[PDB]
């Protein structure tokens, strides 16, 4: 009962992964609300529940399948289904907790984690910073297996949390930033897994602030700069939407145009 997109790591290519992320972006928003050439995701206020989520069914060479659910108002993974079980991050407010009761209503076993999907907490559970968790088509293959065998009781929590970290960056963050999408394309192109460097980490960390900066900007000029980092960790300051046009693909709704 929500729109579904399929992606398989089996035989995946730069093109198959790019096609996947481009499909994800187009399901997340129509692109009708654009500010300074960057699409805005739908405002959660007044959004019908039947339009609130999209699904991404992931499959791997082992022929295991899991179905991620993404909230269209923020592009993030809110939970997933494996077989006859569904799992959801702990939402931040009661209203989102009501929203997710509409996901995977057919499954017999439904669980809410005692933790939300924020990186600080996922990293603690995983026992590693994102800096130490390789991304790529191999990591995604393994994360699909981990998520699926979490539903049999096999996969334990650190490996699951690490697998969420992989999925969230390769799907949700790749959707929000064409820069991160490009980072994953390079890993797939050269068939090489590697962890994200600070240029990726600080984009992921600043998506909400960047969204606010842009939407509240004066003709594109940020009221205050936003600090990022280059690949070597050195400071990079953003003053203007202009440099973000090739970087960020989607913003969360923060105000009306």
């Amino acid at each position: 009962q929500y729109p579904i997109i399929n992606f398989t790591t089996a035989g995946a290519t730069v093109q198959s992964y790019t096609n996947f992320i481009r499909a994800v972006r187009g399901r997340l928003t129509t692109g009708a609300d654009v500010r300074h050439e960057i699409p805005v995701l739908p405002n959660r206020v007044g959004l019908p529940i039947n339009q609130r989520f999209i699904l991404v069914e992931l499959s791997n060479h082992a022929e295991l399948s899991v179905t991620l659910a993404l909230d269209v108002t923020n592009a993030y993974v809110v939970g997933y289904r494996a077989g006859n079980s569904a799992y959801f991050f702990h939402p931040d407010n009661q209203e989102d907790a009501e929203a997710i009761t509409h996901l995977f209503t057919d499954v017999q076993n439904r669980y809410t984690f005692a933790f939300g999907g924020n990186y600080d907490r996922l990293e603690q559970l995983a026992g590693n910073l994102r800096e130490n968790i390789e991304l790529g088509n191999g990591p995604l293959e393994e994360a699909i297996s981990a998520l699926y065998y979490y539903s049999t009781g096999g996969t334990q929590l650190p490996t699951l949390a690490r697998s969420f970290i992989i999925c969230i960056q390769m799907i949700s963050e790749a959707a929000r930033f064409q820069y991160i999408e490009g980072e994953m394309r390079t890993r797939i192109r050269y068939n090489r897994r590697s962890a994200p460097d600070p240029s990726v980490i600080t984009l992921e960390n600043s998506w909400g602030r960047l969204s606010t900066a842009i939407q509240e900007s004066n003709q594109g000029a940020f009221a205050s700069p936003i600090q990022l980092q280059r690949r070597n960790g050195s400071k990079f300051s953003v003053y203007d939407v202009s440099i973000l046009i090739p970087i960020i693909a989607l913003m969360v709704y923060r105000c009306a145009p």
Partner: nanobody, 119 residues
Framework: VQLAETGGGLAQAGGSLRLSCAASGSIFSINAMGWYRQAPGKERELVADISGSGRTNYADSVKGRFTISRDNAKNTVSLQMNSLKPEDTAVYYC??????????????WGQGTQVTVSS
């Protein structure tokens, strides 16, 4: 979310100060905490921050001099400022970001503490 800043104040060049910030409230998906600083006619700059998982960043000019630490049980961060320079004079602001569905769904600032270092 409420932020309580303490510490700071006046110091001599080469002296030491310590800042601390304790968060409370709707805090379950809290992420990075840190300190920005702003001098009277200058741009705000990140001084240091720290994630609940222990990642620490520092402005280049404070490395080897300032150290940040965090206690997740109390949602508190401290900034130990050694070998203070006149250039460290500024209003220092604690910042907390969090969110279950993205890193910085909320972004709260402290009131600001003055730090003044004589040359």
């Amino acid at each position: 979310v409420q932020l309580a800043e303490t510490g700071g104040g006046l110091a001599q060049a080469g002296g030491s100060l310590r800042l601390s910030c304790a968060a409370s409230g709707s805090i379950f998906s809290i992420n990075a905490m840190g300190w920005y600083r702003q001098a009277p006619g200058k741009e705000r700059e990140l001084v240091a921050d720290i994630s609940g998982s222990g990642r620490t960043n520092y402005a280049d000019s404070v490395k080897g001099r300032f150290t940040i630490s965090r206690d997740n049980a109390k949602n508190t961060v401290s900034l130990q400022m050694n070998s203070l320079k006149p250039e460290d004079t500024a209003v220092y602001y604690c910042n907390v970001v969090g969110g279950s569905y993205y890193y910085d769904e909320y972004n709260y600032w402290g009131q600001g503490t003055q730090v003044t270092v004589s040359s």
